[PDB]
Amino acid sequence: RSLVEWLDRGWEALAGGDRPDWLWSRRSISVVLRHHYGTKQRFVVVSYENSVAWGGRRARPPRLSSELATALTEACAAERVVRPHQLSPAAQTALLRRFPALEGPLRHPRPVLQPFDIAAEVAFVARIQIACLRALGHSIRAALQGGPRIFQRLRYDFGPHQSEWLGEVTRRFPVLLENLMRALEGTAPDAFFHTAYALAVLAHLGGQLVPLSDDIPARFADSDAHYAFDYYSTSGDTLRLTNRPIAVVIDEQSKCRFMEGPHRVCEQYLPGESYAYLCLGFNRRLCGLVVFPGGFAFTINTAAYLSLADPVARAVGLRFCRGAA
């Protein structure tokens, strides 16, 4: 009977149960302090004594080695170089001979990610942000280029006094079109992927699966009539008033209806039904619709100006979507 068995019988006296969670707590516990490159904050890596996972005294070979990592530091450290691509290709092939996996980052002509970097993954995101924006402005410029007559694709009745309001929509019309693409550009690349437009892209490229978070309604893949929408404040600061992209089906004028299901007051209204909402929408076909108050709205096809590499498109989806059930 070691001292440990008495400790193991110390609890079983005051416990009334083994409680395996405690049994490892009575053993050795390895606490390694770490830091998070993203938040600069701390997260504690732990490996128990009997833990089968890494750091545990019971573990299966082979274990993790620094062989790839340690060399990569001194490869350009002995060269006093910041980057392995500024390393001479003689030493670059030197580690390749030992390490056949380094071909991918080193020998790939057009790596979808900047090899041997940290923020390279972020650069992957931000360029897609830009890629989506120009797919609008060029397409926005397209339909609006020569001064058009939009008429209205929706159906609303106007009072005699409401006409004076619509007169204000004229003057107020161009300033908003700036402010949209202003904020749309200004959005954080992360949060942008929750917007109704980024979902249409993740839906459209998937059409060429289920985009993650199930934001897409099940019938959004039925007809090109099923849409998604966001709203924007008409007066004062122009902002995005809708967390959840709103799904509406349309059917010249045709009526509209919501779909099946905390509260967003913006959801009791149809697009362009009331003042102080700029109503923006897209499709599975990714034919855009821009709906201003009063129901006056025009189509935009942004699929034409959207340009992306398939190896990028398929790589983006697998991160942002899921294999369909």
């Binding site: 079983e12 416990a15 009334g16 149960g17 083994d18 409680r19």
Partner: protein, 140 residues
């Protein structure tokens, strides 16, 4: 069995909103030591005869195939997990089955605990408390 090397639970029972405590001890453990020496042995004899016969025969056509359909990562995985910390002259396999079915068949008789009392209360409480008398029949 745990005293032959417990949990903080397993000593507390719930019936009809009432709590019990089986701890409430070492005299009781020696009072019950012979059952532990039979409940352990009837299992360790049992699981080995399962383990030393199915790879020994797997007698084939549809008998072993329906057995393997039941052993599709269920019994054979439990075999390969136990035979990892195990092994695979004349072994008295067929003679030990009679010795096992007689012994393990006996413990089912002892731990059966047959009901004699069937309570049909009439003009009374549907739940009879502790210390009270209950109307009891053993007849239809």
């Amino acid at each position: 069995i745990r005293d032959l090397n417990e949990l903080p639970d397993l000593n507390v029972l719930y019936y009809n909103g009432a709590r019990l405590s089986l701890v409430a001890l070492a005299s009781v453990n020696t009072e019950l030591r012979s059952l532990v020496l039979n409940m352990v042995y009837s299992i360790t004899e049992g699981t080995t005869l399962i383990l030393t016969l199915i790879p020994r025969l797997l007698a084939l056509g549809y008998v072993n195939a329906l057995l393997q359909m039941q052993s599709v990562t269920r019994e054979a995985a439990q075999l390969i997990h136990p035979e990892a910390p195990m092994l695979m002259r004349r072994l008295p396999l067929y003679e030990a089955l009679v010795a096992w079915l007689a012994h393990a068949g006996q413990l089912g008789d002892i731990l059966a605990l047959a009901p004699a009392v069937r309570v049909c209360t009439f003009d009374g409480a549907a739940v009879v408390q502790s210390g009270d008398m209950a109307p009891v029949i053993r007849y239809p």
